[PDB]
């Protein structure tokens, strides 16, 4: 099945919620591994809001993307540009995606509530085109 990644550089902002929703919406259709570059944990308050929508994002922490090969994957979202200080084989998968997704790091509850809606919609659109 199609394996997905949602990998921006760093993880304190970006590389959160998108993979969590793709796990949710893409369950039984597609696989998701968001390894990361220059990465860290996801935002603390994200996990609480994301668990309020019933989703884990905390559990992302794994090997860096560089440890993997993109040829094993099918789809990769770069989430914060094209170059992203990321190896080129990752963008050149069967679908390249990247969006001006806003991020709730240190922001008010309105931004967490907004980003859940925003991300659900981007991730549904990504799934709807691949699956």
Swiss-Prot record:
Disulfide topology: 8-80, 80-82
Active site, renumbered: 8 (nucleophile), 80 (nucleophile)
Enzyme Commission number(s): 1.20.4.1, 3.1.3.48
TM segment ranges: none
InterPro entries, A to Z: Arsenate_reductase_gluta, Ptyr_pPase, Ptyr_pPase_sf
Biological process according to GO: response to arsenic-containing substance
Reaction(s) this enzyme catalyzes, per UniProt: O-phospho-L-tyrosyl-[protein] + H2O = L-tyrosyl-[protein] + phosphate; [glutaredoxin]-dithiol + arsenate + glutathione + H(+) = glutathionyl-S-S-[glutaredoxin] + arsenite + H2O
Entry annotated with the keyword Ribosomal protein: no
Pfam families: LMWPc
NCBIfam families: ars_reduc_gluta
SUBUNIT field: Homodimer.
Additional information: Cys-8 probably provides the initial functional group for covalent attachment of the electron-accepting substrate, arsenate, to ArsC.
Name this protein carries in UniProt: Glutaredoxin arsenate reductase
Organism, scientific name: Synechocystis sp. (strain ATCC 27184 / PCC 6803 / Kazusa)
């Amino acid at each position: 099945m199609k394996k997905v990644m949602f990998v921006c550089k760093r993880n304190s902002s970006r590389s959160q919620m998108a993979e969590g929703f793709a796990k949710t919406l893409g369950a039984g259709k597609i696989a998701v591994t968001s390894s990361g570059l220059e990465s860290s944990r996801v935002h603390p308050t994200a996990i609480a809001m994301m668990e309020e929508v019933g989703i884990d994002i905390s559990g992302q922490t794994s090997d860096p993307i560089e440890n993997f090969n993109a040829d094993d994957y099918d789809v990769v979202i770069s989430l914060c540009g094209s170059g992203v200080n990321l190896p080129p084989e990752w963008v050149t998968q069967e679908i390249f995606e990247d969006w001006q997704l806003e991020d709730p790091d240190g922001q008010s509850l309105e931004v967490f509530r907004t980003v859940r809606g925003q991300v659900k919609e981007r991730v549904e659109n990504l799934i709807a085109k691949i699956s």
